């Protein structure tokens, strides 16, 4: 950490607090996150996801019995650029190429078995080339929980790449109407949330789903409202593929690689955004 110079701090985690720092060595810019106190194993072997959407793992440094990762900087997140957006919103075209990027990054780390877990707008990163990057990826083993999948919720252990999805669907809904989807300040407000618009699950929609560790059949029981309603500018096209990404039985989930082929992504597009820094 001599190598280091703090330049101020970008925030703080759920295992490291973050810091964008230059590398004396290098002259480089980048974010820097202190671990807090099999491991050192599996981050070392995170440093092997490359592509386009995904923020580069540049460094693991395990010195004095500390964790520091050092990776690739960018200057904004895409909650304070929808933020910036909010009288306008986002335009469509921009929306669509920013949904078709995660799907690839998605995609890509779920075919390596990497799972990100938190997906929020505050850990997704953008630049002025139009394209956007996933961060604090794989590294889980006030919070919020508005994007958390509902199996989670209800206790399951063993869940699957489809909780990525559910987040990312979460996520798209919220770019498209500049308000939240599903807005819990507590796990069980967070699944009655859930449930009062999706309708509350059964045996039917999701085989399996009264015998989850959390479930309890004194569950209120709310029905399905119309679709048009929530997402109301959204287009079918749209629509459709916001439904596949949101079914509760994660195995009926769509997959980031089939929803990569979605009519939707037809007119798919690489706007650049306007950007203030
Ligand atoms: C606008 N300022 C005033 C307020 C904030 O929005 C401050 O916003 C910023 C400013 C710059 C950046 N750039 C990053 C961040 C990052 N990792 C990262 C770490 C955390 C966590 F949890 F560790 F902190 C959460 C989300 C993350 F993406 N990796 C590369 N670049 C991100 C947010």
């Given at each position: 950490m001599e190598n280091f110079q703090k330049v101020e701090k970008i925030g703080e985690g759920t295992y490291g607090v973050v810091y964008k720092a230059r590398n004396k060595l290098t002259g480089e810019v980048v974010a820097l996150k202190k671990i807090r106190l099999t491991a050192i194993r599996e981050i070392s072997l995170?440093?092997?996801?490359?592509?386009?959407?995904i923020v580069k793992l540049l460094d693991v440094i395990h010195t004095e019995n500390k964790l520091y990762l050092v990776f690739e900087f960018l200057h904004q997140d895409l909650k304070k650029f929808m933020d910036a957006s909010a009288l306008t919103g986002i335009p469509l075209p921009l929306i669509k190429s920013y949904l078709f990027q995660l799907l690839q990054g998605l995609a890509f780390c779920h075919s390596h078995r990497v799972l990100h877990r938190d997906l929020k707008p505050q850990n997704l990163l953008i630049n002025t080339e139009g394209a956007i990057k996933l961060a604090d990826f794989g590294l889980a083993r006030v919070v919020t929980?508005?994007?958390?999948?509902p199996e989670i919720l209800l206790?399951?252990?063993?869940?699957?790449?489809?909780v990525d999805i559910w987040s990312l669907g979460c996520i798209f809904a919220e770019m498209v109407t500049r308000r939240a989807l599903f807005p819990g300040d507590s796990e069980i407000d967070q699944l009655f949330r859930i449930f009062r618009t999706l309708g509350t699950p059964d045996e039917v929609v999701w085989?399996?789903?009264?015998?989850?560790?959390?479930?309890?059949?004194?569950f209120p029981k709310w029905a399905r409202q119309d679709f048009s309603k929530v997402?109301?500018?959204?287009?079918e096209d749209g629509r459709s593929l916001l439904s596949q990404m949101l079914h509760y039985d994660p195995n009926k989930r769509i997959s980031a690689k089939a929803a990569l082929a979605h009519?939707?992504?037809?007119?798919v597009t690489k706007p650049v955004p306007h950007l203030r820094l």
């Open positions: 995170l440093k092997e996801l490359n592509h386009p959407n929980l508005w994007y958390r999948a206790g399951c252990k063993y869940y699957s790449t489809a085989p399996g789903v009264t015998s989850m560790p959390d479930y309890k059949p004194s997402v109301p500018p959204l287009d009519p939707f992504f037809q007119d």
